[PDB]
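Here we describe the complex-level prediction in full. Unlike the single-chain runs in Section 2.1, the four entities below were treated as one system.
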Amino acid sequence: DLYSRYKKLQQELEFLEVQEEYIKDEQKNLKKEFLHAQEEVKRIQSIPLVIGQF
Amino acid sequence: PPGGGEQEPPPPPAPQDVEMKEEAATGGGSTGEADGKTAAAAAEHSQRELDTVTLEDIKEHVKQLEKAVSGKEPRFVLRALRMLPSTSRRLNHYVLYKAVQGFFTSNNATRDFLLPFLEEPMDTEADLQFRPRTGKAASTPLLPEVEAYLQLLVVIFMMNSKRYKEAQKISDDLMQKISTQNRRALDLVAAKCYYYHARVYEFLDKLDVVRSFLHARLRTATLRHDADGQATLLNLLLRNYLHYSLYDQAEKLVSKSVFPEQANNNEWARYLYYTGRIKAIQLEYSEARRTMTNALRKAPQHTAVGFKQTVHKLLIVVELLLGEIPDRLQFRQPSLKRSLMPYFLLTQAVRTGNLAKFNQVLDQFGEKFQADGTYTLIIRLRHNVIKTGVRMISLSYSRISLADIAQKLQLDSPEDAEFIVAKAIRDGVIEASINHEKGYVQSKEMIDIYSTREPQLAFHQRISFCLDIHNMSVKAMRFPPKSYNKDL
Amino acid sequence: TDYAKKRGWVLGPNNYYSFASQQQKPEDTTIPSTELAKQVIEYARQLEMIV
Amino acid sequence: MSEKKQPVDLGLLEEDDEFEEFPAEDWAGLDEDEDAHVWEDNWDDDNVEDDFSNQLRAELEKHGYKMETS
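The structure predicted for the assembly as a whole is:
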């Protein structure tokens, strides 16, 4: 237990380590996706259109 | 007899509620806060405990309490003792012992029961489980209370409190290095202890004991520290080195290590004044000017007034060396005003720089600034007069006359004019052209700024440094929102 | 005598001459443009690293 | 710490116990002309004032005599 807590815990160090570059990949990719869907819903808005009244 | 006899049991019954409510609030708040996971939640009571300490530094607590109010002294924590389970009858006892002193009276005294404060720390401080945090949370607040009024043979009582403090925790520790929130508390708590009886220390003794051990306790932390409390322990060492060390092969640049994350929102200011005070004896003109003025501008929280007269006074003391002495301009408080009330005639006597008059003026009403010790930077001032005055000559026109400006500098010879002007030339702080065509000495005296004079290279470094400061401030608005969204 | 072998300067017609004084030609601005380009690289870094 | 403010403030109470309200009232002789006037201006006005408190204080009355003599 006591001295096994060290090397047992090291695997939790590594498993929490692997989430770092993963959250880097998500944080770099999903904002690119955000400007993807942002520009794509922007280009839905086109200037030829009909005028109504509220 | 009716005047104080009728208003005697009235006034008192008022700090009792806020001190008992305070010790239950920060005691039960600290234990009840970090009890389950002390290691997860850290330093939440750091600002709480220090703000209670600075909240109780201005206590008008004991004025009349020597006469029959001393029941608060033998009473203490008494929380959940003698057995770690089955504390419900002790939850009854909490109301019981507080209610025993509230029936009629109590047999009370002041100076008798001091030495057996170790009765519970022998067996169980509070619970036998949270013994470190309850031991320091029990003992360490009440020791400045009874060891307040350091005078009148309480210095010996302070020595008893010393050996009790070391004897239970800080002889080594009970577990060497606790490695928790009360380890991180115990850094500045043990430091605060050593500052508190440092008055006892310098009162009769000097550097020769716990201060010499404090290097070993200073390095017993293992080095893996953030070194905040290690820096606070360094501050008592450097203040101990202020009055008399003068050797520079250890503390100066040697003590200078990694420069850890040493913040406290106070310790930048007072640490920086301490190293600026010791770096003020070699007459630092560039660095200690700006950063010691910065340390003046730090610590705004409690007072900007009562202490910053010292960094302010030392600051203007080294500012008038450079010829340009800014007075008290933008800060209005009548403490620095009375601080410079002797200094004003001489600091206005800097710029005109009249030798024979102002030499008499300094020592004339010189009482406290020349009783402040050893006349050092004023004795450098006494021949810095003509150098700052001739620096005003450098702020004036180029050619040096043999009658007008030589007589005006009270200095009437062809040799010493060009000679001491040449002593300003070997500085490099000026711009001058040594020319002899007929014997008259020229200077180009060009104070042209870099506006249309190599600007890219000039504020090149300003752009890089300034953007690094602004962009590390961008880091300082990135990471504390991480410290916001961490809990949720 | 000593300063003719210590300084090693020109000794003129009863005058003491001063050379190599503010003679320097200014920079090409190219190498500081390269280190400014490295500053721009580190601005893309420090502005956008964690992102 | 801010408890090292305490002996510095004991020094301050010794400074206030040097003269008891002699400098507050007498320097309030200058403050009653100087109160609510912006004291950044009172450093310039105090600068040239204390500069000419020695000699040639007004001196514009003398320049008309400096015309024919200089």
